[PDB]
Symmetry: C2
Subunit: 597 residues, 2 copies
């Protein structure tokens, strides 16, 4: 549906994410039958929100738990809020969430990484305190995004199984708020910014105002007006100077007011004026070839799981800024909007990515046909499209987002793969014509076996695990890698971005033999990649797999949540960090190095 | 200035620790002269609050910065607040902050761990947005609490020098919030809990609010009214057997109303029925012998500095609950209020300490006399008093605080140490007679050398560095320790708490020789301490020195913030953790082990 970011502009909200809530594990799955949303959570404990619930209690059984959990908290509504259209919103409840304000069900949602909101005006009163109960579910199946298989042992004890790398953290990972708008105008905007030769150009506007006449005002960083538009929707105004550039990200403000006969609603929307477009093998930002550098990240840290935190965010950006990263990719799920906001203001280019990982049973009682009624089916497809919808509906206006990534590492060999993704690709294009589309490719689906990449605009290649198959031989790895890249170039003639490349590296482990798992190896490995990159013209970006060590699912090729990061989980740097700092900062900003110079 | 912890009712507040403010350094120190509060911070960057500024940017030059820093943020004041009174509160700004709303200077404060709030109604329009600017200072001097010295080298670069262990993290470490009160009540309240015997005793009410006739209703955990009084103050109530105990921590609620023809207001406070008494050699919470187990902690974490964090607090308590700790001490400064509330709600007892460390020049260009005018003059003693003042002003009602601490590891050797502290010991008792009092004792200032302990109710001893003075010998240390313990006992016949004991221990270091810095050694060390404890009837409390590794001042002795914890900075357990777990959960709750 319509998705705007709650901001304060004679519009108001009251953070509810003071994180101290009542928490309970519904081991027996009685909570719903016994209407737990009606009375206080029995035998509950204090938990923090935003935050995963898995690691807050240093308890393995809570961490590995699967099924239903219950969040509960009481809150006063601002009295001033009398007849003001009150809506309760959850920025993200990971996987499933159902909400009751005092015995009244108002909400249900399936995605773990996108916001949902409901009008609660008629269930609440200006001066009163209400009970808010949330039922959260962390179970994945073939119709969820991302997919999974719960395994129920003989004892009926649930056990989540999934096909992606990162740990399946759950809970309210993000801000939950209560906000206010005039009864006149609610919930949607859409913007498009065109550019010619960096001489002037226009900004296509269009939005719904929920029964109000809208006027539009484009304002400067100086807060001065530069263009006007009454056109309720379909406003088009030409501008004369300041483009949104990766280095700086100059931002304009679009003021959308909605005039009723009596009520007024004002919404400020930040605008970056830039064109994103593929031309041949180049990826153009304002008609300039751009070269990506940066990371595949992960919403992950020490006690908070995937819970959002302002400190982490400021620190990690200071690292990326130091290291010379000009970009990153929201690896395997949509990030907190505050992340994209930051990017917008600082000119960080982003590859916005759905939660669609684990469409692959070929990465080590599993179904033999990946695309089958039993496994990834029409309903799954429908869930996927829905995931694509809500992400786009949330992020279509961020200048930082230069590209949509529909899925990560699907197995595209089997029959049914192209039957599954062709419709998806088409849909996302119609949903947003402004941005190039992509689907991150697995290694074993190489140029000669892959059956989907032609349906997309830019080639994103995950080449992590080149050290697995090449058994840690650099000489061999460099020859094979250069072979495959050129093959991909001749096949698609698209821009190529390496979206994953790196090696598990144990911090502190040093070796004179420069062998696997040593800081020295991570350097040699990365360096071998960079050398071939500078030799291949179609390569327009390089994103190291993992900014920082994150927790992973249980396994043998797994070392304490694994060590794929350039930085540790506590954000300390391994040797490779300085190697990258040197390559990225010695580089002309956003310019691809000539054949290694 | 009265102190009331804000809470929602027909009373409201809006947290503005929305976490990102504009931020700038003032190296050139042009801030005030150039009237920086007037307009948007130039050349600024994003910062998060609550949190320290030091570690948010992975930059040494910012990390070790001394002088003024600038915080700035805009905020909409809710439109339903018009006729009501609007006030701006800071839970803590570490060291010094002054505030400008738009161009109106509303605030000034010294003491980095206490709240300060001002009525800003005249300078605020309900409908509008106001620019908040804060000038934060991290500099310490001798009149500062904790003391320090800044060296502005001939180059004109300022360098902060101080005398305590932990790093001098600064910034806005805790929540900042606007809040609403009607015109009928302003800041003050007080409560006491006499409990004479097994069944029921009384709760002396007290209250101070301008423009208000007071109701003062009491309440159960079930919201049933079990007692009432009418008097604006001096109220009192007698109840039945429902004791706040360290095991569960049963709480009550006291609803309080102040009333006018125009406006009315009910403030809700929580009450724990407990008595804190020292009977000879024993410490008492409700006429019974208690034995403290826990840690000396710190407000420290990766990235954030001393900034508050819920995930952090929920996790640490999980660990403390698991480990079997029933108590702890806000070591070397006042903790976040949330901590006390948690302790109150869970039944955790808290030795509450003030920011008064560094009063010692022994542990290592400095003044030759500790208590000279050059160092800790009378002007300092007032600042001290001020700091002890304000702590009690915000913690006197918290059931979990069973004891006050006026300072940590002061040097009592120099002539005229008692002249400085005797007044403060006595003066603070007049600020609260409800709770006993203690001063934490440095090691070298033993019974014979130290001249101040007599003015305190229970003895708090820091035996950390028992490994350093004994050059790592366990056989020797144990003898010296026990002998030194009994000397303290018969001198003052006092309840003795060991407030610090442990040894530098590098996680992941193992050794067959069980030598220093090895996880094995730590265990061996802690064990020999426990035995002597078991054999001394005077010891009513033990608290391992440091729950977790914390960042210290730039130190040669320091090794990665020196690794003094049972847990690592990222909360991973050392071997010792499993030892303290086994001992602490292997004994009756709050009960000292039999003669070992």
């Amino acid at each position: 549906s319509h998705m705007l970011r709650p901001v304060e502009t004679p519009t108001r909200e009251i953070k509810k994410l003071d994180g101290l809530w009542a928490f309970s594990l519904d081991r027996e799955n009685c909570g719903i039958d016994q209407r737990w949303w009606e009375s206080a959570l029995q035998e509950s404990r204090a938990i923090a929100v935003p935050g995963s619930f898995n690691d807050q209690f240093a308890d393995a059984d809570i961490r590995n738990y699967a099924g239903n959990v219950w969040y509960q908290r009481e809150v006063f509504i601002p009295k001033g809020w009398a007849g003001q259209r009150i809506v309760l919103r959850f920025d993200a409840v990971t996987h499933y969430g159902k909400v009751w304000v005092n015995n009244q069900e108002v909400m249900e949602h399936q995605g773990g990484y996108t916001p949902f909101e409901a009008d609660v005006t008629p269930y609440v009163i200006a001066g009163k305190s209400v009970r808010i109960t949330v039922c959260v579910n962390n179970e994945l199946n073939w119709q969820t995004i991302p997919p999974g298989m719960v395994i129920t042992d003989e004892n009926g004890k649930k056990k989540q199984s999934y096909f992606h790398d990162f740990f399946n953290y759950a809970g309210i990972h993000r801000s939950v708020m209560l906000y206010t708008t005039p009864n006149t105008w609610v919930d949607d905007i859409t913007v498009v910014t065109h550019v010619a030769q960096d001489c002037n150009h226009a900004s296509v506007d269009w939005q719904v105002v929920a029964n109000g006449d809208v006027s539009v005002e484009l304002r400067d960083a100086d807060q001065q007006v530069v263009a006007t538009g009454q056109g309720t929707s379909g406003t088009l105004q030409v501008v004369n100077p300041h483009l949104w550039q990766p280095g700086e990200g100059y931002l304009y403000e679009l003021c959308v007011t909605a005039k009723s006969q009596t009520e007024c609603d004002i919404y400020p929307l930040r605008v970056g004026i830039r064109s994103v477009a593929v031309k041949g093998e180049q990826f153009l930002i304002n008609h300039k070839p751009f070269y990506f550098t940066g990371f595949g990240r992960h919403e992950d840290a020490d006690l908070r799981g995937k819970g959002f935190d302002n400190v982490l965010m400021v620190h990690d950006h200071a690292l990326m800024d130091w290291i010379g990263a000009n970009s990153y990719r929201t690896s395997h799920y949509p990030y907190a909007e505050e992340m994209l906001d930051w990017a917008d203001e600082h000119g960080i280019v982003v590859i916005d990515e759905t939660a669609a990982v684990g469409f692959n049973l070929s990465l080590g009682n599993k179904p033999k046909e990946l695309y089958s009624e039993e496994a990834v089916n029409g309903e799954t497809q429908q869930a996927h499209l829905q995931a694509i919808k809500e992400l786009i509906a949330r992020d279509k206006n961020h200048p930082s987002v230069v590209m949509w990534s529909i899925a990560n590492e699907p197995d595209t060999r089997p029959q049914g793969a192209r039957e599954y993704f062709a419709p998806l690709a088409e849909a996302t294009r119609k949903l947003d014509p402004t941005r190039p589309i992509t689907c991150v490719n697995v290694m074993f689906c190489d140029a000669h076996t892959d059956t989907i990449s032609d349906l997309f605009d830019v080639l994103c290649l995950n080449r992590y695990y080149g050290w697995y198959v090449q058994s840690g031989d650099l000489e061999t790895a460099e020859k094979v890698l250069e072979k495959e890249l050129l093959a991909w170039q001749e096949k698609l003639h698209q821009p190529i971005i390496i979206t994953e490349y790196g090696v598990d590296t144990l911090a502190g482990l040093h070796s004179m033999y420069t062998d696997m798992w040593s800081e020295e190896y991570q350097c040699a490995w990365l360096d071998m990649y960079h050398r071939v990159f500078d030799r291949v013209s179609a390569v327009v970006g390089e994103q190291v797999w993992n900014f920082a060590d994150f927790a992973t699912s249980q396994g043998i090729l797994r070392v304490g949540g694994n060590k794929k990061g350039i930085f540790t989980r506590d954000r300390k740097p391994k040797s490779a960090a300085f190697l990258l700092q040197k390559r990225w900062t010695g580089m002309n900003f956003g310019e691809k190095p000539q054949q290694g110079g």
